[PDB]
């Protein structure tokens with residue numbers, strides 16, 4: 001009756017502890033989602049096993065094979081009982097798995113190298129010297145592609161045809177590109193990651209402007225799983241009790257290096 | 259098979275149109291939730307009738323009789339098919355009705371008459387000169403009643419017993435009390451409402467400090483209703499289409515006076 005939890009190595013959600021090689025089982029891991037898993041399991045009265053998603057992906061459907069990858073695939077295909085991770089609640093995912101109400105909110109945001117003369121999306125859109133882009137797939141890119149807002153439409157037209165490519169293959173790549181580009185690249189990404197990186201050495205990036213959209217991370221379970229009802233109530237309780245806000249502070253701010 | 263929508267008069271979510279006595283049915287109303295209802299109906303392929311909740315309340319469960327009032331009551335007891343309203347998703351409500359993923363975020367916040375020497379809940383809690391209260395039969399009051407967070411527990415202990423009563427029957431009543439009390443009343447209400455009022459004449463109130471919590475409004479249906487899955491998908495679709503932010507921007511900000 002041990003619950004198999006799928007999650008992903010993404011800081012500060014799930015990280016290998018300092019001495020992890022000398023440790024076993026759930027004790028190898030630390031982070032926001034590790035803490036959150038422990039609290040959900042306590043509330044629902046279950047034992048569980050943390051497992052890192054085999055392919056290191058969140059969950060997208062291949063247009064050709066129709067196969068779901070990532071944590072969503074592990075749920076869809078019966079390999080895990082619950083995903084506890086920074087997994088964005090999207091329409092296509094909601095169609096195939098069940099989600100709790102969100103445990104954390106986020107929106108698209110702008111990361112700059114400190115000293116970059118940019119304070120908003122409008123600022124980016126009106127100029128050319130400072131390049132800017134998104135992950136080469138997912139929620140952030142799709143936001144721009146689809147936007148009917150003039151500023152964002154202008155930004156998309158620019159990003160889609162910019163040379164060399166302004167797209168990056170991973171979050172770490174986007175962050176590195178801001179850091180290496182001497183103020184000549186701004187990266188559009190989730191607020192949560194932006195805010196986390198801002199609190200980390202070498203303390204050379206900053207989040208600017210308001211968020212461009214709004215979405216949430218949810219706990220996911222296989223469609224119709226009986227675990228879903230209980231974990232959803234657990235999320236609502238933990239939020240109301242102030243525990244979710246505490247955990248955010250714990251992992252983003254309390255020991256911020258900046 | 260007309261779907262009966264319960265809702266509530268609350269600006270800018272649902273408002274009486276100017277010539278409403280000369281108007282019929284759904285055409286009597288305007289606002290964010292009126293627009294949202296139309297969009298959800300369109301996505302979901304139903305006809306509907308907007309109805310204003312009979313008792314003018316959001317919804318709470320009486321501790322003695324255990325009966326639910328407000329919009330929640332109308333869903334619980336079978337008097338409406340769906341609520342499309344600024345209806346906060348809470349644990350106690352989630353137990354008795356179904357909710358979509360949130361279509362708007364909010365937190366409890368403090369409204370003051372401008373120059374009132376209060377910057378935080380802590381400030382309110384440490385003094386008695388400036389009275390403070392909340393809306394009856396809503397999630398803000400239920401939050402304080404249930405809170406084990408020390409500062410909020412202290413504020414509830416005060417509010418529950420304050421004379422004369424610090425509680426109001428409608429959001430508009432709390433706002434008027436703030437405006438008429440020469441800085442000696444502060445009103446605890448949701449950030450969304452606070453920010454709307456802050457940008458309306460006579461421009462004499464302000465939101466102070468950070469939000470006290472973080473939560474969201476959901477579209478609600480009776481537990482197990484078939485409309486639920488569909489309406490939830492609609493909310494996700496509308497968010498991904500930019501329509502929720504469009505409506506927010508339309509009814510807030512665009513309508514600012516101050």
Ligand SMILES: N[C@@H](CCC(=O)O)C(=O)O
Nearest residue numbers: 316344345346396397398
């Ligand atoms: N949105 C709240 C009402 C407003 C309040 O309680 O401040 C509810 O659903 O009860």
